[PDB]
C-alpha cells in the first residue's frame, strides 16, 4: 500500500488528474490531493463540476485526503512514495524551479526534491517560451521527471478518453506500477 | 498563395502532418514535403499505409512536392514558414547543433539562418535534461517550440478532435484562417 | 533472468563486449546486442572474424538477439519495455558525442538515450587516447545526466599475466556495477 | 616530404580544395584526400567533373591517396600516423557542427577530431552566409579548442582582377598558415 | 524611397562602393559614414566612385559628429568589438547601437581571417542581439569569372537581405 | 640528451612509470623522478619492492635523480628548462590538486610549472568509474593545455601478455614526447 | 547487519558523531570510523576525552573499527558514508575531488560508486566560497544535512537537540530508531 | 593599537614580510605571524637566516606572536587586517577553494567569512589561466589582490628601495601613515 | 636574426622596455618598437629623456624601427610580440578585440596568428574587472608576465631587479641570453 501526493495545478487537462487518482485508488493506494484555486476553476470549465470527489467513485474516498492549498502546516508538507503535479501550469513550474515553496502544492514538490523522492511534473503549455524551457531544464537537472501530456498515436486511439488513458498510463509506468492503463 | 515546407520526422503523430498538409492544400497553398525514413516507418505503424500521398485527397497532389531526405542540393534548401511535424528529439538535437546534414535538418537551419518562421512540434516523454537543453537553445534562436499537447477546454470527444485542435494551433501561429481553429 | 542491452560501438576492445555478453549469458540472462558497422570492422581486425555470434559459445545463442543498427522501430527502442541495464562497450567518442547531444538517430544511440530519459542504468565504456577537451566535456555532461563513465582501465593490483586477464578484470568491474556475482569479479 | 590530410566538404568553393591540393603536391608533399558525398555534387556543379583527380595534373597523382568517406578504418583515422596538418576546405556548417560536437562518425569528421586530440594543426575554411548564432557558437568553440578558423574572404588589397586571382590569394593564406613557401603567397 | 545607413569601417571598400551606388540606382537615399581608417586610396574622394547623378541622394557624415536599415561594410574587427560592447562613442558606433536598441536591421560585413576566439565571441554576441553577420563569402556556384563578378554577387546577397529586388541578385 | 620529469602518483599501474623511465634513459636522456608516499605503497603492492631504482638497470642510475615529494626548493620546482613532464600513473587526487593550482608538494608543483611555462605536461590518469567531479577537473586541465592520456589498452595491436599492454601504452607516451622508440607501433590497413 | 563509514572531521559538534555511532551499533550494524587529527582536538575540547571509544558503550566496540586518516590503502578505500561533523575544509576537499587522505577518499568513493554520502557541515556564517562547494556536492548526489535544530519537537536540553539531529540522519539512512520523531 | 595577522607563504620576497611586520610593530601595533614550512626555507635562501625574529629588531618582539602552521585551534582562528605576504600560488589556490586546512589558510578563510580585510601579495610569473581564475575568484569575494610590482616612478636606486615602496603600498591600503609611503 | 615587436604602453616600468630592446638588439635581432603617447611622458619622468633611442646604444639603432601608434603599417611574420609595460587600458582593449591603434593591432595579430604575445601588466591592486581581462587573454594564448621581482637572486640595485625581470622575458622568448640566471 503505497502513498502518493497528487498536486493539481490550474492547467488544462484536469481529466488526467481524475484518471490518475482513480487508478491509484483502484490499485489500492492512498492519495493526498491538493487542488489550487485555479485548478478548481479548470475543474468547472473542463469537467462541469465543483467537486473533485464527485468525479471519483465513492468507495475510493476513504483513500483520498483533500488538503487546502494554504496548509503548509500539513503532514504531507514534512513517508511518500511519489509526488505528481498534474496538470502543471508553467507558473507552478516556475515556482518549484525557484524553490518558492510558499503554498502546500509548491511545498510538497520542494520536499520531494529535498528528500530525493520521485517528483513527476506534467506541464501543459504551448508554445513553450525560452523562460519556461529554462525552468523545465533546471527541474530536470535537479531530478524532476518532466512528463508533458504527449499523445501516443501508435496505440491508435479512437476517442479523447483513449488519449487521456494512455497519457496516464505513462505516468503509472514512471511510477513503476502495473496498471492496465499502460500499453 | 503561400509556400510552406513541412518536414515529417520520425516521432509519433504523423496524423498531425497529414492534417496540416491537407488543410494547407485545401486553403490554396503549396507545400514542399520532406519525409524522413523513420517517418516513413511511423507512417506505416500509425496510418497503415506506405504512401504519404494516399492520405491526401488526389485533387490536392498538384500542390505538394515530395523531396528525398538526401536531396541536400534541393531548391528549398536555399519560404513562408517551415514546420517540422511531428519532430523527433533526435532531429531537435541535430537542428539545435546546426547539424544540417540532410534535407530536413537543412531546411530548418535555413529558416533560423534567414529569420523565417520555424515551427517545431517535438514529441517525446519524459523529456530529459539533454532534450530540454536542446529545446531551450532553439527557442532562444527563434524557433517556435510547439509540443502537440491536447487542448481539453475545447472538450474534444474523438482522437481526431484532438489532432484537429493541435493542427488548428499550428494554423493559428501561421496566421491562417481555418475551420480547424477555435 | 534479467534483460540487458549491449551496444557495440567501433572503439578498440571488442573483446570486452565478447566476454561481457558471454558472461551475462552464462549467468542465465537475456542480452539484446546492437552492433554498429564500425564495430563490425573492429571485430574483424581484432578478433579475425566477421560474425559476433561466432565468438559466443553456441548454447548461449538462444539468449542473445542481434538487432540491426537502423532498426529504430525495435521494441528495445521503446521506453515502455523494461530493461535492467544498457551497456555501450566499447564506446567510441563519436557515439559518446551523439548520446551527449541527444542525437538518437540510430538504434544504438537510441537505446542509450532511452535509458537516460527513463533513468535506467546506462554504462558507457569509452576508449580513446588522448582525451581532448571536446571529448571530456561530452563525458562530463553524460555523467551529470546519470550515465556511468567506465573507461577500460587495466587493474594492475590484480597482477595480471596475460592480455586476457586484463580484459576479464575490466569486465568484472562492469559486472560489479551491474550488481551481479560472477567469478570474473575480484 | 610532409604529409597533409585535406577534407573536402559540401560547401561552395571546391576550387579552393583543387588549388590547395595541386599546390601542396607541386611542393612535393603527400596528401590524403577525403571527399564527402555532398562535395562530390559540388564538384560537378562548380567544376563540371565527377572526378576530383581529373582536376589535378596526373604527374602528381602518386602523391595523393583518396579515401572513401565511410572508411573510418583508414590509416589516417588513427593518431599513430603523423600528419603535419589537416585542412577542411571548403567546410560546410554541418561539418563545423559535427566537429564542434566531436561527432567523428565518418572519416572526414574523424580526421578533424584526430587533429584536435593530437594537437596538430587543423584549419577550417567554413563558408556560409549569413552566419547564425548557432553556427558562430560552433566556430567559437572550435577556435577555443585550437582550430584555425579561416573563412574564404577575398583579399582585396591585392587588387585581384579575375576570379582565379581571388581563389589563389585565399589558398595563399592557407599555405601561409602551413608555413609553406609558395608563389601563391604575397 | 527608403533610407539606408552605410558605414565604412577600416579591406574591401569596393563592396561599399558597389552597394551605395546600386542602392542609389534603385532610387533610395544613403547616409554614408567613413572612418578615418577606411579613408586610408587609388582615389581621393569616396564620392568620385559613385556616378555623379546619384550624388544628391548621398550624404557624407564625419565620424566624430555627436531609417530602414544599417549596413557596416566593410566592418573591421575593432568596430565589431566596439558595437558588441556598447561602446557608442563615435557616429558609426552609435548608429549601430541605435539600430540594435530599436530592433532595426543591422547588417555587419566583417572581413577578418583567420577569426580568433575573441572576434568570434563578439560576432556571436552581436548575432544573439539581432545583428545580421554577413561575411563576404564568394558564391562560386554562380561561376564568377572576374573579381568584379564576385563582389557584385556578394552585394546581391546584401540586397536580398534588405528585401530589395536588383539584377545583382542571382 | 633531453631532460624529463616523471612524477609517480599513487594510482595503479606503476609498471608504466618503470617502463617509461627505463626507455627514456635507454634513449640517452635525463630523468628527474618524484614518487609520492602513496606511489611508494603501490610500488610495493604491484611490483613487490620498496625501491623504485631496483626496477631499472643500474647502468641507467647515473641518468636518474630521485627527489623527495616535499622538496619544493628543488631545482626542478623552478621554471630550469625541462623538455616534458609526465605524471604516471596519476591519481584523481593529484589531478584534482593540479587542476586547482594546489602546488603544495614537488609533484604538484612540477605539474604547475609545466602549465605556467607552456611546456608539455602528460597526465596518465587512472580511475574507474569517473565521476562528474573528476571529469570536470580533467576537462579543466585539458583546456589549460595538459595532455590527458588515460592508460587505455590498444587492442588493435593484438597484445598477448600484460607486459605487451603496458609497453604499448608507454609507446603512446613516447609518441607524444615525439621520441623514436621501438616501443611505438602504428596502425596498418 | 549493514556496514557504515563515519568520517569525523574537525568541526564543532563531535557529540553528533558519538550519538550516531552508538545508535548504529545498538541497531546491530558495523561502523568503520575515521577521525581526522582536528576532530581529535575537537573531541578533547568538547567531550573532555582523547578516546573516541571511551564515549561508546563497551559492548559496542566489537562493531567499530577505527582507521588512521593516512591509511589511504585501506579496504574501506558499503551501505552509507556519513561525514559528521564536516568542516568546510573537508567540504572543499571533497567537492574538489582532493581525495588525499582516507576520510576524503571514502567520501569520493561514495560519490564515484553512487552510494549514499551524508555530509553534516557546520560553519556559520557560510561564505559564497563555501556555499559554492556545498552546491557542487549537492549536484553530485551528496546529501547536505547541516545540523539544524528541530525546534517544533520542543527540546529542553542540549542532548535533546543533538538526538533529534541524529534522528534525522537515521531517517535519511532509512533506519528505524527511537531517536526519530514524526511531525 | 591595532591587531594584524601576517601569514608568510612560501613565495619569493620574504623581505616584504620582514619589512611589513617590523614597520607595523614600529607603529605600536600587534602582529600574529604564521610562517609556512616553505617560507621557512625561503627565509633561509633569501635572507641567510633560519630565524624570522632575528630579522626583526629585538625591542619589537613583545608585540609579535608566532603561531605554528598546524595550530588551527587559536584565538586568531578581533583582527584589523590579514595580510598573506608573500603569497604562493598554492596558497592562493587553497584559499580560493576554501581549503582551510592549516592555520594560514584558515585565518584567510576567517577574514573572508567575516568580511574583514584580507590582502594577498601573490608572487608568481608567468600567471597561468589557472592562477588568474583563482585570483579573480578571490577578488570577487573581497580579497585585495596586491602583486608586489616595483613602483618605478619613485626612481628607486637599490633593491631595498623597491621592497620598501612595495610595503608602503600595503601600509597605504591598511590606511596607516608611515614614512615608507612617499 | 629574429624579428620582435615591442609595444610600449603607458605604465610605470619603461626601463623594462629599454633593457629588453637593447638586449634583443645586442643578440643580433630586429625590433619594431611602438611607443604610445602615454609611454613617452613616462619615459621622461622615469628615465629623464624625451628620446627612446637615446637610451639605446647607437650601434643598435640600425636594428630598431620606430612606428607611430597611429599608423596601416606592415606590422599590422614576427617571432614574438611583447607589450611592456602594459597598462590596464591596453589589456582591456586587447581582451575586447578593440584593435584601433597600431599597438592594439599588433597584439591582436599575434593572437590571430597564434604567435607569442607576452604582456607585462603593471597594476596593483588588481580589481576583479582587470583580473577578468587578464584571465581572458591567458585563455586565448597570451603569456601574462607581471614584473615580479626575483628575490632569490638576491639583487642589490634597482637595476639588478630590472635586469632579472627582463631575463625572465628573454627566457619565455627561448633566447639564450646572459641576462638570464637560473635557480
Ligand atoms: C480553463 C483554464 C485552463 C488553463 N490552462 C493553462 C495551461 O494549459 N497552461 C498554463 O500555463 N496556464 C493555464 N491556465 C492559467 C493558469 O491557471 C495560471 O497560470 C494560474 O495562475 C496557475 O495557477 P496554479 O498553478 O497555482 O494552479 C488555465 C486557466 C484556465 C481557467
Ligand atoms: C513507431 C515509432 C514511433 C516513434 N515515436 C517517437 C517519438 O515519439 N519521439 C521520438 O523522439 N522518437 C520516436 N521514434 C524514433 C525516431 O524515429 C528515431 O529516433 C529516429 O532515428 C529519428 O529520426 P528522424 O527524426 O530523422 O525521423 C519512433 C519510432 C517509431 C518506429
Ligand atoms: C580497428 C579500429 C579501432 C578503432 N578504435 C577507436 C577507438 O579506440 N576510439 C575511437 O574513438 N574510435 C576508434 N575507431 C574509429 C571509430 O570506429 C569511428 O570513430 C567510428 O565512426 C565510430 O562509429 P560507432 O561509434 O558508430 O561504432 C577505431 C576504428 C578501427 C577500424
Ligand atoms: C552546390 C552546393 C553548394 C553548397 N554550399 C554550401 C555552403 O556554402 N555552406 C553550407 O553550409 N552548406 C552548403 N551546401 C549544402 C551542404 O552540402 C549540406 O549542409 C551538407 O549536408 C553538408 O555535408 P558535408 O559537409 O559532409 O559535405 C551546398 C550544397 C550544394 C549542392
Ligand atoms: C589596407 C588595410 C586593410 C585592412 N583590412 C582589415 C580587415 O580586412 N579587417 C580588419 O578587421 N581590419 C583591417 N584593417 C585595419 C582596421 O582598419 C583597424 O581594425 C582599424 O583600427 C579599425 O578602425 P575602424 O573600424 O573604426 O575603421 C586594415 C587596415 C588597412 C590599412
Ligand atoms: C594499491 C593501491 C592502488 C590505488 N589505485 C588508485 C587508482 O587507480 N586511482 C586513484 O584515484 N587512486 C588510487 N589509489 C588511492 C590513491 O593513491 C589516493 O587517492 C592517494 O591519496 C593519491 O595520492 P598521490 O596522488 O599524491 O600519490 C590506490 C591506492 C592503493 C593503495
Ligand atoms: C627559494 C624559493 C622561492 C620560491 N618562490 C615561489 C614563488 O615565487 N611563487 C610560488 O608560487 N612558489 C614559490 N616557491 C615554492 C612554494 O614554496 C611551493 O609551491 C610550496 O608548496 C607552497 O607552499 P606555501 O605557499 O603554503 O608556503 C618557492 C620555493 C623556494 C625554495
Ligand atoms: C574546538 C574546535 C572547533 C572547531 N569547529 C569548527 C567548525 O565548527 N567548523 C569549521 O569549519 N572548522 C572548525 N574548526 C577548525 C577545523 O578543524 C579546521 O578548519 C581544520 O583545518 C579542518 O580539519 P579536518 O580535515 O579535520 O576537517 C574547529 C577547531 C577546533 C579546535
Ligand atoms: C606617470 C604615469 C604613470 C602611470 N603608470 C601606470 C601604471 O603603472 N599602470 C597602469 O595601468 N596605468 C598607468 N598610467 C596611466 C595609463 O597610461 C592610462 O591608463 C593610459 O590612458 C593608458 O594608455 P596606454 O597604456 O595605451 O598608453 C600611468 C600614467 C602616468 C602619467
Explain the overall architecture.
This is part of a larger assembly, with nine copies of chain A. With 183 residues, chain A is of the alpha/beta class. Chain A has six helices and six strands; from the N terminus they run E-H-E-H-E-E-H-H-E-H-E-H. The longest helix of chain A is centred in the C-terminal third of the chain and has 15 residues, at 160-174. The radius of gyration of chain A is 15 Å and the shape is globular. The first copy, chain A, starts with a strand and ends in a 9-residue tail after the last helix. The C-F interface holds C 12-15, 42, 45-46, 127-133, 136-137, 139-140, 143-144, 148-157, 159-163, 165-167, 173, 177 and F 12-15, 42, 45-46, 126-132, 135-136, 138-139, 142-143, 147-156, 158-162, 164-166, 172, 176, 189.
Strand proportion of chain A, as a percent range, falls in 15-25%
What is bound: which ligands? Answer: flavin mononucleotide
Main sheet properties of chain A: 6 strands, parallel
So how many helices of chain A? Answer: 6
Which value, in Å, is the CA radius of gyration of chain A?
Answer: 15 Å
Helix/strand/pairing class of chain A, anyone?
alpha/beta
Strand ordering within the main sheet of chain A: 3-2-1-4-5-6
Q: What is the approximate shape of chain A?
A: globular
Helix content of chain A: 25-40%
Count of distinct strands of chain A: 6
Order of helices and strands of chain A: EHEHEEHHEHEH
Oligomer type: part of a larger assembly
Amino acid at each position: 500500500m503505497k502513498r502518493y501526493v497528487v498536486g493539481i495545478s490550474g492547467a488544462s487537462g484536469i481529466v488526467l488528474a481524475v484518471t490518475l487518482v482513480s487508478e491509484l485508488a483502484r490499485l489500492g493506494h492512498h492519495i493526498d490531493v491538493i487542488i489550487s484555486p485555479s485548478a478548481q476553476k479548470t475543474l468547472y470549465y473542463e469537467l462541469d463540476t465543483k467537486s473533485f470527489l464527485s468525479t471519483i467513485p465513492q468507495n475510493f474516498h476513504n483513500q483520498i485526503v483533500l488538503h487546502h492549498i494554504s496548509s503548509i502546516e500539513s503532514s504531507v508538507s514534512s513517508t511518500i512514495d511519489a509526488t505528481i503535479i498534474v496538470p502543471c501550469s508553467v507558473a507552478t513550474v516556475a515556482a518549484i524551479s525557484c524553490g518558492l515553496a510558499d503554498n502546500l502544492l509548491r511545498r510538497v514538490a520542494d520536499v520531494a526534491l529535498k528528500e530525493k523522492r520521485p517528483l513527476i511534473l506534467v506541464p501543459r503549455e504551448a508554445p513553450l517560451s525560452a523562460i519556461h524551457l529554462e525552468n523545465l531544464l533546471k527541474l530536470a537537472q535537479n531530478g524532476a521527471v518532466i512528463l508533458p501530456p504527449m499523445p501516443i498515436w501508435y496505440f491508435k486511439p479512437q476517442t479523447a478518453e483513449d488519449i487521456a488513458n494512455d497519457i496516464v498510463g505513462k505516468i503509472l509506468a514512471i511510477l513503476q506500477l502495473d496498471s492496465p492503463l499502460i500499453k
